[PDB]
């Protein structure tokens, strides 16, 4: 096996939202097999990284990453809210995110 | 009941124990593979 996971998989969903009001300050994350509030709480302090690819190289690379902290659980069904260093692009709304094991 | 207990055991296991189990499985696979080869 080449490469080791060490993170839980996730899907970076919408922003924190009304019915028709945005709130880009928080993102909503679905974490693989976590379906309840209680389970969600386990991940609360863990660090989240949205890694993404680009055409132009930057710090000599095609992959860059934005970091976040995972702030609180979100309503009954294991979803969590995550707050990031800089707000996530909505291009990301169906994308994968990584929830690391540290803190 | 048995399956429940197995599940419980799995839940309660230490990382090392999981690793041990994995090792055992691997060993079995090796042996199993050999047996299969022999059969063939």
């Amino acid at each position: 096996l080449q490469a080791v996971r060490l993170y839980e998989k996730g899907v970076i969903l919408g922003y924190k939202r009304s019915q028709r009001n945005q709130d880009p300050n928080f993102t909503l994350i679905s974490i693989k097999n976590v379906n309840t509030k209680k389970h969600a709480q386990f991940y609360v302090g863990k660090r989240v990284a949205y890694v993404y690819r680009t055409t132009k190289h930057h710090d000599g690379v095609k992959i860059k990453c934005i970091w976040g902290k995972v702030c609180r659980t979100h309503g009954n069904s294991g979803v969590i809210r995550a707050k990031f260093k800089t707000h996530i692009p909505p291009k990301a709304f169906g994308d994968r995110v990584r929830i690391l094991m540290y803190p | 009941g048995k399956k429940m207990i197995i599940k419980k055991k799995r839940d309660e296991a230490t990382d090392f124990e999981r690793f041990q189990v994995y090792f055992a499985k691997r060993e079995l696979k090796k042996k199993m593979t050999t047996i299969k080869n022999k059969k063939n």
């Binding site: - | 799995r10 499985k25 047996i35």
Partner: protein
């Protein structure tokens, strides 16, 4: 919904609920193949359903029916339409989600060899009381002109035989594996064996 592509076996499901289930997943970011769409059930009585369909058909655009409500009468098509209804398809994300969905009548080329999933919170057996009238979608489609129902059924039947054949082989393989395991459990190491036994395997 973290899989590459979920194949959903649409037999024995309850239409609208199924559609709803699909839609959310699609939105999230999941490739869904709704397969075997002839056997999706609707919670109303068959006649009622038919009437509803007729009514829907009647609402066409008055000036030029080339545009307006396209009354797609294939069961798969109907399902797709339903899914779309439950989506923000007028945006870009919604459109993408819609595209991601694929609907099939019966079972085609690759989706016979892929694992078929079931949505338990949408099943007819779990959502309807058995004294209420339900309606098979294929039948409904046939009633409102689909024609290719019998053919589809035949195809399904044919596929079933193949599946059975494959299943037998699979069973045999499983048995063989079990036998091998039984043989080899004595050939490992005592402590290891014990450990294995303890952890169910």
């Amino acid at each position: 919904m973290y899989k590459k592509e979920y194949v959903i076996d649409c037999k024995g499901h309850l239409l609208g609920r199924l559609a709803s289930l699909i839609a959310k997943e699609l939105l999230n970011g999941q490739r869904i193949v709704a397969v075997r769409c002839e056997d999706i059930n609707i919670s109303g009585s068959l006649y009622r359903n038919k009437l509803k369909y007729q009514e829907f058909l009647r609402l066409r655009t008055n000036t030029n029916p080339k545009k307006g409500p396209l009354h797609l009468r294939e069961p798969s098509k109907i399902l797709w339409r339903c899914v779309r209804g439950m989506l923000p398809h007028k945006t870009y994300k919604g459109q993408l989600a819609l595209k991601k969905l694929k609907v099939c009548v019966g079972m085609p080329y690759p989706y016979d060899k892929k694992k078929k999933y079931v949505l338990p919170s949408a099943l007819r057996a779990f959502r309807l009381k058995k004294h209420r009238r339900y309606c098979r979608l294929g039948t409904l489609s046939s009633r409102v002109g689909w024609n290719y129902d019998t053919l589809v059924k035949k195809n399904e039947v044919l596929r079933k035989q193949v599946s059975k054949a494959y299943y037998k082989k699979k069973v045999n393989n499983l048995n063989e594996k079990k036998e091998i395991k039984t043989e080899a459990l004595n050939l490992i190491n005592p402590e290891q064996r014990q450990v294995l036994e303890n952890f169910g395997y």
